[PDB]
Amino acid sequence: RRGEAEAVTPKIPYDLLKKYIAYARKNVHPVLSREAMEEIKRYYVKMRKGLRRGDEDGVQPIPITARQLEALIRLSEAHARMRLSETVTREDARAAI
Amino acid sequence: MDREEMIARFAKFLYINRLKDLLTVTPKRSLAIDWAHLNSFDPELADELLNNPEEAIASAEDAIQIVLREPPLLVEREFKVHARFYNLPKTLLVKELGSEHINKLIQVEGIITRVSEVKPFVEKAVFVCRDCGNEMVRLQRPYENLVKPAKCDACGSRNIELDVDKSRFLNFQSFRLQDRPESLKGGQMPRFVDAILLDDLVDAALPGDRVLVTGVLRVILEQREKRPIFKKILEVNHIEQLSKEIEELEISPEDEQKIRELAKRKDIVDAIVDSIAPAIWGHRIVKKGIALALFGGVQRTLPDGTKLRGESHVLLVGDPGVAKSQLLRYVANLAPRAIYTSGKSSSAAGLTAAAVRDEFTGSWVLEAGVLVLADGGFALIDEFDKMSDRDRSAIHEALEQQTISISKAGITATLNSRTTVIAAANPKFGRFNRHKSLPEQLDLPPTLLSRFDLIFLLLDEPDEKVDASIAEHILKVRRGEAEAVTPKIPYDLLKKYIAYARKNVHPVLSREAMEEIKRYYVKMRKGLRRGDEDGVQPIPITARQLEALIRLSEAHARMRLSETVTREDARAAIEIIEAMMKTIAVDEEGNLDVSILEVGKSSKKINKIEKLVDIIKSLESEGEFGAPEEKVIEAAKQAGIGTKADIEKLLNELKSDGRVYEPRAGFYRVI
């Protein structure tokens, strides 16, 4: 309310980030790598070894399913789109975990 | 224009033996003039017939009457014979039909969905009046309304009435033509055109039958603002059936050598299973049964009065939350004449046929459902448990007798339902339970479940085992790489492969395959152990399942383009049946056909003697309301029926059907 620049002015301008969104979706596209898919294998099997049977009661829904995996690899390419590095990595997929 | 010139050109054109054979028969009142003979005589006469269709048809009306009164050919009784055009140069479709073809002669292919009954109709309506001898002539259309003079033309006596003596009366029948499902790609909706049938065109075909019509696209109700010419009318001139090869697929002789090359190719059975839906990983037993349902067996005909079916209906029960429809969507892209619908098909007829009310005419109109339009093909239905009450009654006749018999006021039909049904029904609960039977977790009736040949339990992985680990690696390749989602046989080539086998290949069982099926049947029937007395006895295998084993054996020989069924096709069909009979239709260790009655035989032996000890305590009357519920459960635990749980769960299904009701808390009596 008082108008300090440290609490109001961001790091990059709003017009620069608005051009950063439309430009990143056109040219660069994240593709899957070998080291990034291995990190998703350790997270998926850990969430449903016994925690699958513990969560459901026979008719209760599963915490993580094949449709839930589509929500993870979409966020894996989402974290790499902010970097625009065109490849996903193990630390990039870990940010999606 | 040139209406008088078209009379002299049609008189010179009027082939002669067809007109000479027309006068010998009395009910036939129409000559079928081909368009190729019209183009050879005068192409400008055929060009004028298209732009002005009404005056050129009427020019064909009177010119055939001069030929009927010719000095070579003279008949004293000269009835107005209609002219019929056989094959127009352009064959239109319903989806490509537009407003340019109004008042234009067109040839539209399609399939009948709606039908109406025979009803009279006045063509030339003359009107007489009382207290005056004046008359007036008025012509009317079946789509147009009956016109009425408000007053008389002579004096205006306000006594205008229709006289039926001098009026010309014709027959009327309105049907609806929709797009064919084999010519409609997925993602498109079929359009509808409401047509009419006049005096000779009445009762030309049935609903669910594909016809090729040639007619003048008339129009009606051109209100200025009240209504924007919403109604269109195809005044059908000549009708025929387009099932003449045109309906068949476009199988090329270059591709026919590629089809026979797949038969010589090793592991073609393994190649077809991998080609059918390679995007979804796993379910190879389900993929084999779907491939065995995509092909069929030979429909053998018996002189006793029935016909052996060759359709292998497969219902995919599965689980809610697993894919369950990508197998339905890829097969509907692959199977010929496939109509991918849901359980709620958003129609008044549904999956079966029904008689509905028409908005164009107040008469009753019979609508053909999904199981009628897909005749000779496939009807892939999703959410099969949520199905209508009228559809639940006619689903038994449509899957055994392949007919849908619906009776209405003046409407009676026996429309054929020879459709291989690949259905999918979600369970009513949250997930499938292995400790309960299959029809106890399904909304379908028990008699409907026995109609299907193969049932597959598409259950997810119960733990994070090695099956779930390699299911992850294929999905990363599918989404991120898209390199192992291509099939060994492409979709257009495999679609030509299935239709070539179902049309040409008709295998026959051999003596080695007959010995393998007979040995497996007597081995399973001898496996029953007589462990129960004074009750209903379990049966290991029903002879209805023996007919399903023959249909799966002939589909395996049709899968690799073989004209004979060896014992390898028999042993493959037994292993699919034995894998099917172990997941579903299984009492505790006895593989019992529980599908025929929705309950086990041990469950019937439990429930019958539970009501028996409920009856003998009701006459003894230990409680005030006969037999107490507390007294009947401790004697059941004494007799060995079970604990306090399973008898309590046995009595709620007793009052739901009316076997053993409960008067109050702690009391239970039988009816």
Side-chain angles (χ1 to χ4, degrees), chain A residues 1 3-7 9-14 16-17 19-22 24-59 61-83 85-89 91-97, chain B residues 1-4 6-11 13 15 18-19 22-25 27 29-41 43 45-46 48-69 71-73 75 79 81-140 142-222 228 230-247 249-299 301-356 358-407 409-430 432-439 441-460 462-463 466-477 479-528 531-588 590-597 599-610 613-614 616-630 632-636 638-643 645-649 651-653 655-658 661 663-667 669-671:
Chain A
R1 174 215 52 81
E4 282 77 69
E6 306 78 10
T9 62
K11 283 99 164 181
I12 54 174
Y14 296 107
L16 184 54
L17 191 46
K19 287 301 182 62
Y20 188 79
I21 296 174
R25 303 177 189 177
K26 186 57 180 298
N27 42 38
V28 70
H29 293 317
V31 285
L32 288 193
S33 66
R34 296 301 303 183
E35 67 275 349
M37 297 170 319
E38 169 54 65
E39 202 266 308
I40 317 187
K41 302 311 161 58
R42 287 194 301 272
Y43 171 71
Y44 182 83
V45 182
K46 195 189 300 176
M47 290 303 125
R48 51 175 301 184
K49 208 181 290 271
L51 302 172
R52 214 203 74 81
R53 180 73 263 176
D55 281 358
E56 63 164 53
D57 283 8
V59 290
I62 306 169
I64 171 160
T65 332
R67 194 182 174 86
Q68 197 72 29
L69 187 65
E70 314 273 352
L72 197 143
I73 55 182
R74 215 165 299 142
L75 295 190
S76 198
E77 296 160 348
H79 186 268
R81 192 74 61 88
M82 306 179 47
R83 307 152 56 218
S85 62
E86 197 267 331
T87 62
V88 291
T89 43
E91 81 267 350
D92 171 84
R94 192 54 185 184
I97 291 313
Chain B
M1 38 165 279
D2 58 276
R3 193 183 73 91
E4 190 51 82
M6 285 190 292
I7 303 173
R9 291 171 89 176
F10 263 117
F13 179 52
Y15 183 75
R18 308 190 293 111
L19 183 60
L22 167 59
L23 55 97
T24 77
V25 298
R29 296 152 292 180
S30 55
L31 183 53
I33 306 176
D34 200 79
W35 198 264
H37 299 80
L38 189 60
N39 291 20
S40 315
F41 181 72
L45 182 66
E48 198 60 43
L49 201 147
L50 286 178
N51 302 56
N52 283 266
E54 189 72 29
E55 308 200 289
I57 277 174
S59 314
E61 285 314 297
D62 52 2
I64 203 167
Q65 294 300 295
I66 315 163
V67 173
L68 266 182
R69 292 164 295 190
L73 193 64
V75 177
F79 184 69
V81 176
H82 311 86
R84 307 305 166 93
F85 310 105
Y86 192 73
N87 268 341
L88 295 194
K90 185 178 294 183
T91 304
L92 276 78
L93 277 79
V94 184
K95 43 188 298 180
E96 69 189 28
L97 192 48
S99 297
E100 195 262 337
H101 309 102
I102 305 183
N103 306 321
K104 181 77 64 68
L105 190 82
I106 48 175
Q107 180 179 32
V108 178
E109 57 178 4
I111 182 172
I112 304 184
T113 59
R114 283 180 181 246
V115 74
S116 88
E117 62 263 359
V118 182
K119 281 198 166 187
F121 162 69
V122 54
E123 190 183 18
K124 177 181 59 184
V126 284
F127 291 93
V128 289
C129 71
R130 319 267 78 85
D131 202 51
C132 169
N134 193 25
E135 278 204 5
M136 40 205 65
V137 58
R138 275 98 174 92
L139 263 73
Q140 284 154 11
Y143 49 88
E144 286 169 9
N145 220 38
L146 186 144
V147 307
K148 276 295 301 193
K151 274 193 261 223
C152 172
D153 303 348
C155 73
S157 315
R158 291 182 183 271
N159 265 267
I160 302 307
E161 210 177 29
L162 175 72
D163 47 301
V164 307
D165 283 328
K166 295 189 300 301
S167 311
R168 298 184 305 183
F169 280 81
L170 274 77
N171 302 91
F172 164 70
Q173 173 172 322
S174 57
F175 87 104
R176 169 178 292 192
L177 197 70
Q178 276 197 356
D179 271 304
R180 306 178 300 161
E182 60 265 5
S183 66
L184 196 79
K185 199 65 177 176
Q188 306 171 4
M189 293 191 61
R191 303 180 182 180
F192 59 96
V193 168
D194 295 2
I196 49 170
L197 304 167
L198 275 75
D199 182 74
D200 279 343
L201 280 304
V202 164
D203 263 349
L206 270 300
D209 187 25
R210 297 156 174 86
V211 289
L212 175 60
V213 302
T214 74
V216 182
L217 197 75
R218 281 293 147 208
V219 55
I220 171 247
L221 226 302
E222 196 96 14
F230 59 93
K231 189 68 179 190
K232 174 186 299 301
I233 299 295
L234 186 46
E235 183 198 347
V236 171
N237 184 256
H238 165 77
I239 196 161
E240 57 182 340
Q241 306 290 340
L242 78 162
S243 301
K244 35 182 173 53
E245 177 180 0
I246 141 180
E247 180 180 352
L249 290 177
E250 58 271 11
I251 318 292
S252 316
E254 171 198 2
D255 204 71
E256 188 182 357
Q257 288 326 288
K258 297 163 66 60
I259 289 312
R260 296 171 187 177
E261 202 183 345
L262 291 178
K264 313 178 183 63
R265 174 186 170 186
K266 188 60 66 68
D267 55 274
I268 180 61
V269 181
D270 194 24
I272 282 157
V273 165
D274 286 315
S275 314
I276 293 173
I280 165 166
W281 173 88
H283 311 267
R284 191 175 171 177
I285 312 297
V286 193
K287 278 179 186 177
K288 179 72 71 57
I290 281 177
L292 279 174
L294 275 183
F295 303 99
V298 185
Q299 288 88 8
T301 318
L302 316 176
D304 209 8
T306 53
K307 288 176 299 181
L308 301 168
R309 76 181 204 189
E311 290 90 8
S312 170
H313 317 301
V314 170
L315 160 75
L316 284 80
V317 177
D319 194 276
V322 80
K324 205 187 154 62
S325 177
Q326 313 168 197
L327 284 178
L328 295 177
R329 281 187 173 90
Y330 290 157
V331 163
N333 189 264
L334 191 65
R337 297 193 201 175
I339 311 190
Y340 174 70
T341 54
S342 178
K344 315 152 291 313
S345 45
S346 316
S347 183
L351 298 175
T352 53
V356 306
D358 184 38
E359 279 302 278
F360 168 62
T361 307
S363 45
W364 288 86
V365 158
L366 183 67
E367 186 89 63
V370 193
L371 294 181
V372 190
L373 302 183
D375 176 75
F378 288 82
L380 285 94
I381 311 154
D382 208 344
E383 305 177 7
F384 201 67
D385 57 325
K386 309 166 186 175
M387 188 174 71
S388 157
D389 315 327
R390 177 198 55 243
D391 281 2
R392 273 172 185 270
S393 316
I395 201 79
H396 295 78
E397 199 191 5
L399 273 72
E400 285 292 329
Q401 278 80 229
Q402 314 292 92
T403 43
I404 300 175
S405 87
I406 171 66
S407 192
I411 292 177
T412 39
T414 322
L415 311 175
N416 303 11
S417 197
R418 304 155 293 191
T419 71
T420 307
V421 174
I422 314 295
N426 286 117
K428 44 185 171 184
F429 286 94
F432 185 77
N433 303 122
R434 291 288 181 170
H435 49 80
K436 292 162 61 182
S437 43
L438 175 68
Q441 309 182 63
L442 202 58
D443 212 17
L444 295 185
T447 43
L448 178 51
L449 191 70
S450 296
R451 306 313 195 255
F452 304 103
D453 292 12
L454 286 170
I455 308 287
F456 296 108
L457 286 178
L458 278 78
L459 267 191
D460 46 29
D463 48 28
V466 287
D467 187 271
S469 174
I470 56 185
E472 295 283 287
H473 169 66
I474 182 63
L475 203 146
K476 307 306 189 312
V477 168
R479 182 69 167 85
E481 269 88 5
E483 55 187 1
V485 301
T486 178
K488 301 179 182 179
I489 302 176
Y491 284 89
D492 44 353
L493 175 64
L494 196 54
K495 181 160 193 298
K496 294 160 178 290
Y497 188 81
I498 302 166
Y500 182 79
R502 291 167 65 95
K503 185 228 300 177
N504 292 110
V505 178
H506 296 280
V508 61
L509 295 158
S510 48
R511 279 301 309 184
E512 201 164 6
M514 276 180 66
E515 194 180 359
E516 182 55 51
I517 293 176
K518 259 176 58 184
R519 180 163 61 244
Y520 163 70
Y521 188 76
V522 303
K523 181 186 60 184
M524 197 58 60
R525 283 289 262 258
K526 276 193 300 295
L528 174 78
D532 61 297
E533 271 296 289
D534 313 308
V536 57
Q537 191 90 358
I539 175 77
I541 179 168
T542 297
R544 257 196 179 186
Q545 302 187 7
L546 187 67
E547 306 171 8
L549 185 63
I550 298 158
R551 289 191 296 260
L552 290 179
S553 305
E554 292 172 340
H556 202 288
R558 204 179 271 191
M559 190 149 45
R560 62 168 184 269
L561 261 59
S562 174
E563 288 185 16
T564 174
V565 189
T566 180
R567 75 168 181 180
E568 320 295 321
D569 295 325
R571 274 303 304 174
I574 290 167
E575 194 183 3
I576 295 302
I577 280 298
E578 211 187 70
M580 195 264 302
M581 287 298 297
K582 276 164 185 177
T583 74
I584 76 142
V586 49
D587 215 5
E588 293 93 5
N591 63 271
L592 158 68
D593 307 0
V594 304
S595 315
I596 201 69
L597 281 186
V599 293
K601 262 63 158 184
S602 88
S603 279
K604 281 187 288 290
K605 273 194 58 58
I606 276 172
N607 202 285
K608 190 69 154 173
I609 76 181
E610 169 65 37
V613 307
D614 211 298
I616 66 154
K617 294 259 191 103
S618 198
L619 320 172
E620 183 212 16
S621 277
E622 293 187 354
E624 52 96 20
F625 282 162
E629 204 160 310
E630 174 47 43
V632 81
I633 187 153
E634 53 86 21
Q638 174 214 330
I641 310 299
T643 183
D646 53 354
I647 285 100
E648 166 65 36
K649 310 305 300 312
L651 60 90
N652 50 48
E653 39 175 20
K655 42 184 74 161
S656 315
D657 283 358
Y661 58 93
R664 50 158 75 184
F667 280 94
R669 288 202 319 268
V670 307
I671 209 176

Coordinates of all heavy atoms in Angstrom, one line a residue, chain B residues 315-324 381-386 423-430 432 441-444:
Chain B
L315 N -18.4 -59.4 -24.1 CA -18.7 -58.3 -23.1 C -17.4 -58.1 -22.3 O -16.9 -59.1 -21.7 CB -19.9 -58.6 -22.3 CG -20.0 -57.8 -21.0 CD1 -20.5 -56.4 -21.3 CD2 -21.0 -58.5 -20.0
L316 N -17.0 -56.9 -22.2 CA -15.8 -56.5 -21.4 C -16.2 -55.8 -20.1 O -16.6 -54.7 -20.1 CB -14.9 -55.6 -22.2 CG -14.0 -56.2 -23.4 CD1 -14.8 -56.4 -24.6 CD2 -12.8 -55.3 -23.6
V317 N -16.3 -56.6 -19.0 CA -16.8 -56.1 -17.8 C -15.7 -55.1 -17.2 O -16.0 -53.9 -17.0 CB -17.1 -57.2 -16.8 CG1 -17.5 -56.6 -15.4 CG2 -18.1 -58.1 -17.3
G318 N -14.5 -55.6 -16.9 CA -13.4 -54.7 -16.5 C -13.6 -54.0 -15.2 O -14.2 -54.5 -14.2
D319 N -13.1 -52.7 -15.1 CA -13.1 -51.9 -13.9 C -13.3 -50.5 -14.3 O -12.9 -50.1 -15.4 CB -11.7 -52.1 -13.2 CG -11.8 -51.5 -11.8 OD1 -11.6 -50.3 -11.6 OD2 -12.0 -52.3 -10.9
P320 N -14.0 -49.7 -13.5 CA -14.1 -48.2 -13.8 C -12.9 -47.5 -13.4 O -12.4 -47.6 -12.3 CB -15.3 -47.8 -13.0 CG -15.4 -48.7 -11.9 CD -14.9 -50.1 -12.4
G321 N -12.3 -46.7 -14.4 CA -11.0 -46.1 -14.2 C -9.9 -46.6 -15.0 O -8.9 -45.9 -15.2
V322 N -10.0 -47.8 -15.5 CA -9.1 -48.3 -16.6 C -9.7 -47.9 -17.9 O -10.8 -47.3 -17.9 CB -9.0 -49.9 -16.5 CG1 -10.2 -50.6 -17.2 CG2 -7.7 -50.4 -17.1
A323 N -8.9 -48.0 -19.0 CA -9.2 -47.4 -20.3 C -10.6 -47.8 -20.8 O -11.5 -47.0 -21.0 CB -8.0 -47.7 -21.2
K324 N -10.8 -49.1 -21.1 CA -12.0 -49.8 -21.4 C -12.8 -49.3 -22.6 O -13.8 -49.9 -23.0 CB -12.9 -49.7 -20.1 CG -14.0 -50.7 -20.0 CD -14.9 -50.4 -18.8 CE -16.3 -51.0 -19.0 NZ -16.2 -52.5 -19.1
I381 N -20.8 -51.1 -28.0 CA -21.6 -50.4 -27.0 C -20.8 -50.2 -25.8 O -20.3 -51.2 -25.2 CB -23.0 -51.0 -26.7 CG1 -23.7 -51.4 -28.0 CG2 -23.9 -50.1 -25.9 CD1 -24.6 -52.6 -27.9
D382 N -20.6 -48.9 -25.4 CA -20.0 -48.6 -24.1 C -21.1 -48.4 -23.0 O -22.2 -48.0 -23.4 CB -19.1 -47.4 -24.2 CG -18.0 -47.4 -23.2 OD1 -18.0 -48.2 -22.2 OD2 -17.0 -46.7 -23.4
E383 N -20.7 -48.6 -21.8 CA -21.6 -48.5 -20.6 C -22.9 -49.4 -20.8 O -24.0 -48.9 -20.8 CB -22.0 -47.1 -20.3 CG -20.8 -46.2 -20.1 CD -21.1 -44.7 -19.8 OE1 -22.4 -44.5 -19.7 OE2 -20.2 -43.9 -19.8
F384 N -22.7 -50.7 -21.0 CA -23.8 -51.6 -21.3 C -24.7 -51.9 -20.1 O -25.8 -52.4 -20.3 CB -23.2 -52.9 -21.8 CG -24.2 -53.7 -22.6 CD1 -24.7 -53.2 -23.9 CD2 -24.6 -54.9 -22.2 CE1 -25.6 -54.0 -24.6 CE2 -25.5 -55.7 -23.0 CZ -26.0 -55.2 -24.2
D385 N -24.2 -51.6 -18.9 CA -25.0 -51.8 -17.7 C -26.2 -50.8 -17.6 O -27.2 -51.1 -17.0 CB -24.2 -51.8 -16.4 CG -23.4 -50.5 -16.3 OD1 -23.0 -49.9 -17.3 OD2 -23.3 -50.1 -15.1
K386 N -25.9 -49.6 -18.1 CA -27.0 -48.5 -18.0 C -27.7 -48.6 -19.4 O -27.4 -47.9 -20.3 CB -26.3 -47.2 -17.8 CG -25.4 -47.1 -16.6 CD -24.5 -45.9 -16.6 CE -23.5 -45.9 -15.5 NZ -22.6 -44.7 -15.6
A423 N -19.6 -55.4 -26.3 CA -20.1 -54.5 -25.3 C -19.1 -54.3 -24.1 O -18.1 -55.0 -24.0 CB -21.4 -55.1 -24.7
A424 N -19.4 -53.3 -23.3 CA -18.6 -53.0 -22.1 C -19.5 -52.5 -21.1 O -20.1 -51.4 -21.3 CB -17.5 -52.0 -22.5
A425 N -19.5 -53.2 -19.9 CA -20.4 -52.8 -18.8 C -19.6 -52.6 -17.6 O -18.9 -53.5 -17.1 CB -21.5 -53.9 -18.6
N426 N -19.7 -51.4 -17.0 CA -19.1 -51.1 -15.7 C -19.8 -51.8 -14.6 O -21.0 -51.9 -14.7 CB -19.0 -49.6 -15.5 CG -18.0 -48.9 -16.3 OD1 -18.3 -48.0 -17.2 ND2 -16.7 -49.2 -16.1
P427 N -19.1 -52.2 -13.6 CA -19.8 -52.7 -12.4 C -20.5 -51.6 -11.6 O -20.1 -50.5 -11.7 CB -18.7 -53.4 -11.6 CG -17.4 -52.7 -12.0 CD -17.6 -52.4 -13.5
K428 N -21.5 -52.0 -10.8 CA -22.3 -51.0 -10.1 C -21.5 -50.5 -8.9 O -21.8 -49.4 -8.4 CB -23.6 -51.6 -9.7 CG -23.6 -53.0 -9.1 CD -24.9 -53.5 -8.9 CE -24.9 -55.0 -8.5 NZ -26.3 -55.6 -8.4
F429 N -20.6 -51.3 -8.3 CA -19.8 -50.9 -7.2 C -18.6 -50.1 -7.6 O -18.4 -49.7 -8.8 CB -19.4 -52.1 -6.3 CG -20.6 -52.7 -5.6 CD1 -21.4 -53.8 -6.1 CD2 -20.9 -52.2 -4.3 CE1 -22.4 -54.3 -5.4 CE2 -22.0 -52.8 -3.6 CZ -22.7 -53.8 -4.1
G430 N -17.7 -49.9 -6.7 CA -16.5 -49.1 -6.9 C -15.5 -49.9 -7.8 O -14.9 -49.4 -8.7
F432 N -14.3 -54.3 -9.0 CA -14.7 -55.7 -9.0 C -14.0 -56.5 -7.8 O -12.8 -56.3 -7.5 CB -14.2 -56.4 -10.3 CG -14.7 -57.8 -10.5 CD1 -16.0 -58.1 -10.8 CD2 -13.8 -58.8 -10.3 CE1 -16.4 -59.4 -10.9 CE2 -14.2 -60.2 -10.4 CZ -15.5 -60.4 -10.7
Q441 N -22.1 -58.4 -9.0 CA -21.5 -57.0 -9.1 C -21.9 -56.3 -10.4 O -21.2 -55.3 -10.7 CB -20.0 -57.1 -8.9 CG -19.6 -57.9 -7.7 CD -18.0 -57.9 -7.6 OE1 -17.4 -56.9 -7.3 NE2 -17.4 -59.1 -7.7
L442 N -22.8 -56.8 -11.1 CA -23.2 -56.3 -12.4 C -24.7 -56.0 -12.5 O -25.5 -56.8 -11.9 CB -22.8 -57.2 -13.6 CG -22.6 -56.5 -15.0 CD1 -21.6 -55.4 -14.9 CD2 -22.2 -57.6 -16.0
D443 N -25.1 -54.9 -13.2 CA -26.5 -54.6 -13.3 C -27.2 -55.4 -14.4 O -28.4 -55.2 -14.6 CB -26.6 -53.1 -13.6 CG -27.9 -52.5 -13.0 OD1 -28.5 -53.1 -12.1 OD2 -28.3 -51.4 -13.4
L444 N -26.4 -56.2 -15.2 CA -27.0 -56.9 -16.3 C -27.8 -58.1 -15.7 O -27.4 -58.7 -14.7 CB -26.0 -57.4 -17.3 CG -25.2 -56.3 -18.0 CD1 -24.3 -56.8 -19.1 CD2 -26.3 -55.3 -18.7

